[PDB]
Each structure stands twice: as C-alpha cells, then as structure tokens.
C-alpha cells in the first residue's frame, strides 16, 4: 500500500553541545493571553512531550511580535528560525507558488504556524500577510533548544 | 553459527589504531578544479551538488561534491562539513565509499570520491517496487558490518536512507555522504538526518548515541522489504508524530522473523533496541532473520548479489536521474577562508 514517494533531502539543525557555564538566574505573562498558548500548544509535538518544568520555562521564552497591516510575518522562501502564534488580529495565507500565487486561508485570534522551525531551519511554506493590527507570539529555535537540551543533559542515563 | 563465524576482535583493534592515525593527519589541496571536466550533475544537496567529473589529464571519472562555503557558513552547518571530509578520508571499509583527494578555492570545498555508476538503491528500490527478504537481507548484513566497523571507532554515521546507498558494479553497497558523520565520546545532540529515518531520541532533543544508527537500520530494512518506509505522511511533522508514537504495521507478506527483528530495531526504548544491549551488535548477528547469513563471505564480498544494475562503460550516467546543470565559477575574492583552514 502507501504512496507519496520521491527522493528525500536531509534535515539538519545547528551544531550544539552544552557543557559550559549556565549563568542566567520571563516576559509579561499577560495571564489571560497566557491560557491561549498553553492551549494552542497542547497540540504541538515538541510541546506535548515536555515536562511541566520544561513547559513552564518554555512559555516565557516566547517574545511578543507586533504587526499592523499589509505586513508580512513570514515570507514564503525565508529561512526563519522562529515559531509564532496568533494572539490577536487577523492574518491571511498566500500560498504564493506552483507558478501563480493565490490565497488559501484565514487566521483570526487563533491558529499557529512555523512549528517546523523549532527543530531545524527550513523554507517558509507560505507568506502570511497581516489583515491585522494583531499581536503574535514568537519563539527562537535556539532559545528553545537550549532550554530543552540543558535540561536533558542533567538526566542520568544507563551506560 | 551467528556471531561466531567471524573473529573480529584483533581486526577492530588495528582498524582503530589506523583510524586514529589518519584522522589526526589528513591531506590538503591534493587536486585542482581546473583538472576536472564537469560532465553532469549526479545529485543536488543543500550546500551544493555532486557532479560526475573527468580529469583532463587522467581521463578518469569521479563523483565530485561541491560546497558553497558561504552557504555552509550561512546555515552554520560548518562543523559537520569539516567532519565529513576528515572522517571520510580517515576510514576504510569494503562497503564504505572512498575519497581520492580534496581541495578548495575562493568559493568552494571539493571532495573527490570514486564514482559508483550503480546509482542509489533508491532508484532501483523505487523501480523494482520492493525486494525479497533475501535481497533486502543481503544489503542489511552489509550495513550491520559497517555500523559495527564505524561504531567501534566511536563514529556515528547519522544518515542512513536508500538515497545514500550506492550499488556498485558487483551489486554491493557503497555508503556515501558523511555530512552528519561525527565522532562521539558519549552522546551528541544536533537534530539531523532524513525525516522518515530519524530516531525518536533525535526528534525530541534527548541526547543520543550509536543507537540511532541501529534504529535507522530497522527502517531501512523495512523500506527495502516493504516498499515504503514504516513512518510516512504528508507533513514531516506528521512523520515525527508517528516515529515518536512508534506504532507500526507490517505488510502481511513480511515473514515472522523480519517482524521480530524490526520490533527490536525499531524499539523506542533505546535500552531495549537491538545493537544497543549488553551483547551489542551480536544480538543482531544472532537474530533468527540473519540465520542464513554468511558474515565472513558477506565481508569478503564473496556472495553473488541478487541484483546488479545495467552497466555500460566509462562514464555511464544513466542509472542516475537528471539534474538542472547550473555552472559554477570560483571567485576573485575568498570567502570564509579562516573558517575552513583544516580542509
Ligand atoms: N561516490 C559517489 N558516486 C556516485 N554518486 C554519488 C557519490 N556520492 C554521492 N553521489 C550521488 O550524489 C547524491 C548527492 O550527494 P550527497 O552527498 O548525498 O548530497 P548531500 O549534500 O549530502 N544532500 P543530502 O544527501 O540530502 O544530505 C547522492 O544521493 C548520490 O546519488
Ligand atoms: Mn548530506
């Protein structure tokens, strides 16, 4: 059975291995808006497996992205290393490609994208121009990886 | 029989002493671009492409992988790049593709590998639909011995998939692409490989080891024998969800031993995955499925391949798809030269 075949390329994130210092010692909870993420993420992969400890430290890692209108959060083709989340506002989806460049969707005070840049770098799948003013939530891949990696190195393994 | 047919302890002792030696002392600029005719692009990667080439003075054909230093630098995968060169030029194994020389210029990094007109197992696997357990097993015994080899040197290949498996003039595998090949003391982190082949420990940033290559083995054996990969879907995220869940179904034709050996290779609990237990690789060499295998013969390549590609003569570039030839010019200005001084 099955299908969907065709030569497959190789995915690769940035090089990394902790073992350094661990200095440091959190953005505005916005609380009400807080629930939005802890709910819009309960569907994301790299989030579903997290520990409450890792989850917690992860919500704060996400900064606040603003955009008025006619603005472009993510251009189709861009490398991008950030995972975003609609908080407020409206955004349309231009799958600009195949030859032409139509429209294909509507995000509004809900809906997230870029989950694939939390693992490695990869070409944005579509331009997401803002029909907003709206506020988005972004999270750097690096910012994210460090949180998880630093935490997992502490875990004792069976050699 | 099993793991008692071939005695390999003394061999891996010398192999290790021979690898540490060549690794610590490479070779730089052992060739020149203006010495090779860029016949045709055999494959395109991320940082470059592998073009068939012919030395003007030798009239010899080789596979040439080209890498845009700036892009490498751009994407920050500059380390694996150097490791690919150094590690590859440092190994020797019957099923490992050989490098002849290398060099660099103002814009690119050149690795000149032997040419394997056989093509990727992927081209044949996709064409032949799927292979018999025998045929599939034949290739497997070869990976198992290369993984044993490579791992004993404390190396992790990190990129097993039909696409990187060359079938030569005798029907044997030539592993290519050492882009993720890294030396590992205890464990590593870089998330990398090829979607349908990534183990669960890599996807979730859990720190991994030589046990992710064994997982890839269970996938490979699967795709060879079944036709399709065990974990497949439109969205790679849809692929990662499944790999992680780990649940898989088996073609009704898959014999009972193939199903047993894959359940242990595609074991999510790595402290239970075959190749990573107390007996290491031996559990694999003693599994029922590998009951009919002659390891000593396999190693010496003294076994008739169940399939040998159609091979004409010098330069045959038919076993390979076609690719958008896009000329490459060096530069009057060197780019990121201090970040590749080892090459
Ligand atoms: N020694 C070789 N002989 C013949 N063809 C080769 C050889 N090495 C590589 N190729 C071919 O060139 C293709 C691309 O080389 P490869 O090293 O895999 O590119 P890459 O940069 O690693 N991209 P990726 O494989 O997705 O990580 C391979 O899939 C083979 O088809
Ligand atoms: Mn590669």
XYZ file of C-alpha atoms and ligand atoms in Angstrom:
534
model
C 0.000 0.000 0.000
C 1.001 3.631 0.693
C 2.465 6.249 -1.705
C 3.840 9.864 -1.706
C 7.370 8.844 -2.833
C 10.199 10.988 -4.214
C 13.892 11.423 -3.373
C 14.204 12.861 0.163
C 16.616 15.563 1.283
C 18.478 15.793 4.605
C 17.312 17.920 7.522
C 19.916 19.458 9.854
C 19.777 21.843 12.783
C 22.619 23.988 14.070
C 25.553 22.298 15.831
C 25.300 22.148 19.609
C 26.565 20.531 22.834
C 26.098 22.349 26.208
C 28.785 21.681 28.821
C 29.720 25.344 29.511
C 28.529 27.530 32.427
C 24.721 28.002 32.810
C 24.516 31.623 34.010
C 21.155 33.464 33.759
C 19.369 33.117 37.111
C 10.492 35.722 31.559
C 8.175 38.007 29.578
C 4.867 39.534 30.724
C 2.501 36.650 31.487
C -0.421 38.717 30.161
C -2.199 35.801 32.065
C -5.476 35.832 30.119
C -3.439 35.670 26.904
C -1.312 33.092 28.722
C -4.068 30.463 28.630
C -4.188 30.908 24.850
C -0.676 29.494 24.363
C -0.912 26.713 26.941
C -3.982 25.698 24.887
C -2.759 26.332 21.334
C 0.349 24.296 22.186
C -1.359 21.269 23.741
C -1.465 20.226 20.086
C 2.170 20.851 19.142
C 4.613 17.941 19.028
C 7.800 19.208 20.659
C 5.474 20.611 23.339
C 3.291 17.579 24.029
C 6.273 15.540 25.285
C 7.705 18.290 27.513
C 7.837 18.194 31.294
C 5.877 20.794 33.259
C 9.278 22.147 34.187
C 10.302 22.428 30.550
C 6.852 23.639 29.537
C 6.895 26.456 32.079
C 10.370 27.680 31.196
C 9.264 27.461 27.529
C 6.231 29.764 27.646
C 8.418 32.603 28.973
C 10.982 32.043 26.222
C 8.450 33.400 23.699
C 8.669 37.103 22.903
C 5.929 39.473 21.706
C 5.671 40.222 17.968
C 3.605 43.185 16.727
C 2.296 43.871 13.216
C -0.108 46.476 11.813
C -1.354 45.596 8.331
C -0.140 44.803 4.837
C 2.701 43.439 6.955
C 4.484 40.115 6.356
C 5.240 37.933 9.430
C 6.681 35.132 7.262
C 7.687 35.305 3.578
C 7.448 32.130 1.541
C 11.048 31.151 0.915
C 12.593 32.608 4.074
C 14.868 30.518 6.283
C 13.274 31.554 9.555
C 14.195 30.167 12.957
C 11.069 31.187 14.868
C 7.786 29.592 15.853
C 4.867 32.014 16.000
C 1.350 32.105 17.430
C -1.570 34.410 16.619
C -2.668 36.183 19.829
C -4.865 38.909 18.349
C -5.567 40.316 14.896
C -6.277 38.631 11.592
C -3.871 37.198 9.017
C -4.447 35.772 5.550
C -2.483 32.948 3.875
C -0.952 33.373 0.388
C 0.450 30.016 -0.718
C 2.122 32.171 -3.422
C 3.645 29.369 -5.513
C 3.054 26.494 -8.015
C 3.571 29.166 -10.705
C 0.935 31.690 -9.637
C 0.211 32.965 -6.140
C -3.358 32.873 -4.866
C -4.766 32.914 -1.331
C -5.646 29.868 0.785
C -6.541 30.711 4.359
C -7.660 32.922 7.233
C -6.173 33.033 10.746
C -8.058 35.128 13.326
C -7.326 35.449 17.054
C -6.367 31.755 16.854
C -4.099 29.465 14.742
C -0.316 28.993 14.779
C 2.430 28.331 12.243
C 6.139 27.559 11.869
C 6.194 24.502 14.127
C 8.822 23.091 11.759
C 11.420 25.764 12.557
C 11.599 24.688 16.230
C 13.525 21.628 15.066
C 15.729 22.886 12.275
C 15.782 25.549 9.612
C 13.549 25.176 6.604
C 11.855 27.252 3.829
C 8.681 29.047 4.941
C 5.709 27.277 3.320
C 3.660 30.408 2.629
C 3.543 34.191 3.003
C 1.406 35.275 5.912
C 0.456 38.913 5.369
C -1.454 40.573 8.208
C -5.092 41.613 7.789
C -4.498 42.800 11.366
C -3.477 45.014 13.554
C -2.809 41.982 15.707
C -0.283 40.675 18.237
C 1.769 37.485 17.709
C 3.887 35.188 19.901
C 7.272 34.069 18.583
C 9.938 31.701 19.889
C 13.507 31.387 18.633
C 14.703 27.900 17.726
C 17.983 28.449 19.590
C 16.275 29.987 22.607
C 14.105 26.852 22.617
C 16.762 24.147 22.007
C 18.964 25.405 24.840
C 16.063 25.189 27.276
C 15.389 21.548 26.354
C 18.993 20.436 25.845
C 20.378 21.972 29.046
C 17.585 20.217 30.951
C 18.081 16.786 29.375
C 21.861 16.647 29.904
C 21.247 16.640 33.661
C 19.181 13.422 33.372
C 21.173 10.343 34.424
C 21.373 7.614 31.794
C 22.259 3.926 31.944
C 25.682 3.335 30.389
C 26.586 -20.022 13.750
C 25.704 -16.350 14.190
C 28.359 -14.090 15.675
C 30.834 -16.966 15.993
C 31.546 -17.443 12.299
C 33.939 -14.487 12.082
C 36.514 -13.492 14.695
C 36.812 -9.720 14.600
C 38.450 -8.566 17.854
C 42.025 -8.202 16.582
C 40.773 -6.533 13.378
C 38.905 -3.703 15.102
C 41.967 -3.165 17.259
C 44.156 -2.374 14.254
C 41.324 -0.621 12.454
C 41.043 1.709 15.431
C 44.771 2.357 15.515
C 44.700 3.013 11.778
C 41.793 5.415 12.006
C 43.144 7.497 14.903
C 46.314 7.860 12.846
C 44.775 9.127 9.571
C 42.264 11.301 11.414
C 44.987 13.267 13.215
C 46.859 13.744 9.943
C 44.763 14.407 6.735
C 45.871 15.880 3.368
C 45.216 19.338 1.933
C 44.788 20.588 -1.610
C 45.618 17.274 -3.280
C 43.985 18.313 -6.546
C 42.745 21.216 -8.632
C 39.389 22.186 -10.082
C 40.935 23.056 -13.455
C 41.796 19.381 -13.731
C 38.271 18.039 -13.986
C 35.604 18.112 -16.717
C 32.193 18.707 -15.058
C 30.298 16.084 -17.077
C 26.862 16.052 -15.386
C 25.207 16.790 -12.017
C 24.531 13.401 -10.364
C 22.795 14.904 -7.365
C 21.989 18.207 -5.708
C 22.248 18.665 -1.953
C 21.718 21.661 0.323
C 25.141 23.297 0.223
C 25.944 22.046 -3.232
C 25.871 19.190 -5.685
C 27.718 16.081 -6.788
C 28.740 16.241 -10.417
C 30.244 13.463 -12.482
C 33.730 14.562 -13.470
C 36.609 13.561 -15.691
C 40.206 14.573 -15.027
C 41.572 16.258 -18.159
C 44.977 14.595 -17.776
C 43.761 11.223 -16.431
C 40.527 10.930 -18.370
C 39.201 9.410 -15.170
C 35.710 9.736 -13.786
C 34.899 10.572 -10.182
C 31.955 11.943 -8.203
C 32.572 15.495 -7.088
C 30.663 17.034 -4.214
C 30.755 20.855 -4.252
C 30.002 23.057 -1.219
C 29.366 26.788 -1.067
C 31.450 27.882 1.898
C 29.268 30.978 2.373
C 26.105 28.853 2.476
C 27.756 26.368 4.818
C 28.697 29.384 6.935
C 25.289 30.920 6.248
C 23.466 27.853 7.585
C 26.066 27.339 10.352
C 26.498 23.637 9.494
C 30.205 24.431 9.085
C 31.348 21.780 11.598
C 29.777 18.696 10.029
C 31.295 19.933 6.771
C 34.840 19.684 8.097
C 33.970 16.419 9.850
C 32.606 14.892 6.649
C 35.904 15.470 4.899
C 38.244 14.399 7.742
C 36.253 11.371 8.848
C 35.672 10.018 5.359
C 39.320 10.378 4.398
C 40.064 8.511 7.592
C 38.045 5.296 7.124
C 38.482 2.117 5.141
C 35.775 -0.496 4.841
C 34.538 -2.766 1.987
C 31.156 -1.032 1.944
C 32.411 2.480 2.607
C 32.819 4.802 -0.414
C 36.389 6.019 -0.935
C 37.708 9.566 -1.285
C 40.610 10.129 -3.682
C 41.522 13.728 -2.872
C 40.209 17.167 -1.999
C 40.953 20.859 -2.313
C 39.390 24.305 -2.024
C 39.243 27.678 -3.757
C 37.868 31.149 -3.143
C 34.251 29.912 -3.003
C 34.050 26.134 -2.767
C 35.106 22.956 -0.999
C 35.808 19.976 -3.188
C 35.722 16.317 -2.233
C 36.581 13.886 -4.999
C 35.071 10.448 -4.399
C 35.293 7.336 -6.536
C 32.368 7.090 -8.949
C 29.717 4.429 -8.465
C 27.812 4.187 -11.739
C 25.454 1.818 -9.977
C 23.153 4.550 -8.723
C 21.262 4.923 -5.455
C 19.474 1.857 -4.099
C 16.632 4.350 -4.107
C 16.477 4.397 -7.895
C 16.168 0.648 -8.025
C 14.055 0.097 -4.954
C 11.534 2.596 -6.334
C 11.603 0.962 -9.741
C 11.523 -2.676 -8.589
C 8.732 -1.819 -6.140
C 10.222 -3.848 -3.269
C 12.856 -6.564 -2.805
C 12.603 -10.112 -1.492
C 13.574 -10.622 2.118
C 16.676 -12.416 0.744
C 17.646 -9.478 -1.490
C 16.865 -6.971 1.303
C 18.768 -9.003 3.873
C 21.786 -9.075 1.553
C 22.115 -5.302 1.795
C 21.347 -5.375 5.554
C 24.181 -7.709 6.508
C 26.407 -5.102 4.836
C 25.128 -2.184 6.926
C 25.330 -4.205 10.112
C 29.026 -4.818 9.472
C 29.708 -1.236 8.515
C 27.869 0.066 11.525
C 29.880 -2.332 13.651
C 33.020 -1.045 11.996
C 32.162 2.651 12.177
C 30.796 2.499 15.723
C 33.826 0.720 17.157
C 35.856 3.742 16.022
C 33.266 5.657 18.070
C 31.704 7.231 14.996
C 28.044 7.849 14.250
C 27.031 7.937 10.562
C 23.705 9.684 11.278
C 22.220 9.481 7.802
C 21.031 6.073 6.596
C 18.440 6.046 3.737
C 18.249 4.405 0.269
C 19.387 7.694 -1.310
C 22.873 7.479 0.222
C 23.389 3.835 -0.655
C 25.316 3.187 -3.876
C 25.120 -0.175 -5.626
C 28.424 -0.743 -7.438
C 29.463 -2.931 -10.416
C 29.098 -6.125 -8.325
C 25.811 -5.208 -6.654
C 27.384 -4.145 -3.335
C 26.673 -1.122 -1.164
C 28.943 1.918 -1.058
C 27.861 4.256 1.728
C 28.306 7.884 0.730
C 27.541 11.247 2.319
C 29.403 11.651 5.603
C 27.729 15.021 6.132
C 26.475 14.048 9.580
C 29.303 11.617 10.362
C 30.691 12.658 13.759
C 32.987 11.153 16.400
C 31.217 10.588 19.685
C 32.690 10.115 23.149
C 29.389 9.551 24.965
C 26.432 11.213 23.283
C 25.587 14.064 20.950
C 22.627 16.432 20.243
C 22.400 18.059 16.745
C 18.913 17.184 15.372
C 19.728 15.762 11.979
C 19.260 13.152 9.276
C 16.321 12.495 6.947
C 12.745 12.690 8.299
C 11.442 9.159 7.725
C 14.734 7.887 9.219
C 15.197 9.992 12.381
C 15.005 8.006 15.632
C 12.794 9.142 18.485
C 15.737 10.274 20.613
C 16.851 12.772 17.950
C 13.481 14.362 17.193
C 12.887 15.224 20.866
C 16.337 16.538 21.832
C 17.029 13.724 24.260
C 20.754 13.256 23.682
C 21.640 10.212 21.594
C 24.333 7.755 20.577
C 25.334 4.968 18.196
C 21.870 3.555 18.912
C 20.209 5.956 16.428
C 22.076 4.324 13.521
C 20.622 0.951 14.537
C 17.151 2.439 14.553
C 17.772 3.722 11.028
C 18.737 0.158 10.189
C 15.335 -1.120 11.180
C 13.749 1.494 8.977
C 15.981 0.744 6.013
C 15.342 -2.996 6.230
C 11.699 -2.114 6.418
C 11.526 0.125 3.325
C 13.603 -2.341 1.338
C 11.367 -5.258 2.245
C 8.024 -3.445 2.335
C 8.436 -0.940 -0.472
C 7.504 2.077 1.610
C 9.027 3.494 4.848
C 7.418 2.471 8.178
C 6.596 6.073 9.064
C 5.100 8.167 6.274
C 2.733 11.092 5.775
C 2.416 14.474 4.030
C 3.697 16.714 6.799
C 7.118 15.656 8.139
C 5.595 16.778 11.442
C 3.029 14.116 10.710
C 6.029 11.814 10.295
C 7.649 12.850 13.554
C 4.374 12.357 15.415
C 4.302 8.749 14.161
C 8.016 7.931 14.717
C 7.560 9.147 18.299
C 4.343 7.224 18.801
C 6.369 4.354 17.372
C 3.381 2.230 16.376
C 3.845 0.446 13.049
C 2.028 -2.087 10.881
C 3.641 -4.809 8.823
C 2.920 -5.933 5.245
C 1.120 -9.255 5.543
C 3.928 -10.766 3.419
C 6.638 -9.802 5.894
C 7.826 -13.106 7.394
C 7.734 -13.679 11.160
C 11.446 -13.156 11.724
C 11.535 -9.885 9.871
C 8.746 -8.728 12.145
C 10.702 -9.846 15.202
C 13.975 -8.270 14.203
C 12.286 -4.945 13.314
C 10.382 -4.827 16.587
C 13.768 -4.869 18.342
C 15.476 -2.460 15.974
C 12.567 -0.028 15.882
C 12.368 -0.184 19.681
C 11.544 3.209 21.192
C 13.184 2.325 24.470
C 16.826 2.525 23.399
C 17.854 0.492 26.432
C 15.916 -2.292 24.646
C 16.792 -1.672 20.994
C 18.884 -4.353 19.255
C 22.509 -3.371 18.758
C 22.464 -1.339 21.941
C 22.065 -4.071 24.563
C 24.816 -5.886 26.515
C 25.819 -8.116 23.585
C 25.721 -5.107 21.296
C 25.640 -5.869 17.577
C 25.762 -9.607 18.180
C 22.091 -9.846 19.132
C 21.541 -8.687 15.549
C 24.032 -11.204 14.090
C 22.239 -13.989 16.041
C 18.655 -12.967 15.332
C 16.682 -15.676 13.504
C 16.246 -13.496 10.431
C 20.021 -13.422 9.933
C 20.143 -17.194 10.319
C 21.120 -17.884 6.710
C 23.784 -15.194 6.520
C 27.484 -15.937 5.985
C 29.163 -12.942 7.641
C 32.702 -13.900 6.605
C 31.573 -14.252 2.998
C 29.481 -11.093 3.191
C 32.535 -9.157 4.413
C 34.822 -10.545 1.722
C 32.096 -9.735 -0.788
C 32.173 -13.453 -1.656
C 28.416 -13.757 -2.317
C 26.510 -13.217 -5.554
C 24.377 -10.094 -5.364
C 20.721 -10.774 -6.121
C 20.829 -7.741 -8.430
C 23.438 -5.893 -10.488
C 22.479 -2.651 -12.305
C 22.833 -2.325 -16.080
C 26.394 -1.120 -16.592
C 27.725 0.038 -19.964
C 31.185 1.592 -19.859
C 33.280 4.565 -18.581
C 31.029 7.495 -17.678
C 27.645 5.762 -17.805
C 25.372 8.335 -16.145
C 22.079 6.582 -16.890
C 21.409 4.895 -13.546
C 21.036 8.461 -12.295
C 18.109 10.822 -12.750
C 18.797 14.148 -14.475
C 19.549 17.456 -12.800
C 19.461 21.163 -13.632
C 23.107 21.783 -14.624
C 23.997 25.188 -13.150
C 27.601 26.251 -13.904
C 29.963 27.084 -11.048
C 32.616 29.820 -11.057
C 35.242 30.270 -8.331
C 35.953 33.882 -7.379
C 38.476 36.684 -7.292
C 37.573 37.042 -3.613
C 37.977 34.310 -0.998
C 35.028 33.823 1.345
C 35.130 32.445 4.895
C 38.652 31.161 4.439
C 39.726 31.152 8.102
C 36.701 29.038 8.959
C 37.855 26.145 6.768
C 41.630 26.245 7.246
C 41.596 22.500 8.071
C 40.186 21.366 4.722
N 30.656 8.380 -4.740
C 29.541 8.650 -5.427
N 29.344 8.031 -6.612
C 28.219 8.300 -7.297
N 27.216 9.113 -6.985
C 27.443 9.702 -5.802
C 28.548 9.540 -4.988
N 28.437 10.323 -3.849
C 27.279 10.917 -3.987
N 26.610 10.563 -5.134
C 25.272 10.951 -5.583
O 25.068 12.322 -5.291
C 23.880 12.464 -4.479
C 24.052 13.660 -3.602
O 25.202 13.519 -2.759
P 25.037 13.839 -1.210
O 26.336 13.718 -0.533
O 24.081 12.869 -0.599
O 24.429 15.340 -1.197
P 24.100 15.969 0.218
O 24.757 17.299 0.279
O 24.625 15.110 1.315
N 22.477 16.188 0.335
P 21.713 15.132 1.327
O 22.033 13.725 0.908
O 20.206 15.350 1.254
O 22.184 15.338 2.765
C 23.748 11.121 -3.783
O 22.426 10.897 -3.299
C 24.152 10.161 -4.899
O 23.127 9.905 -5.837
Mn 24.147 15.032 3.399
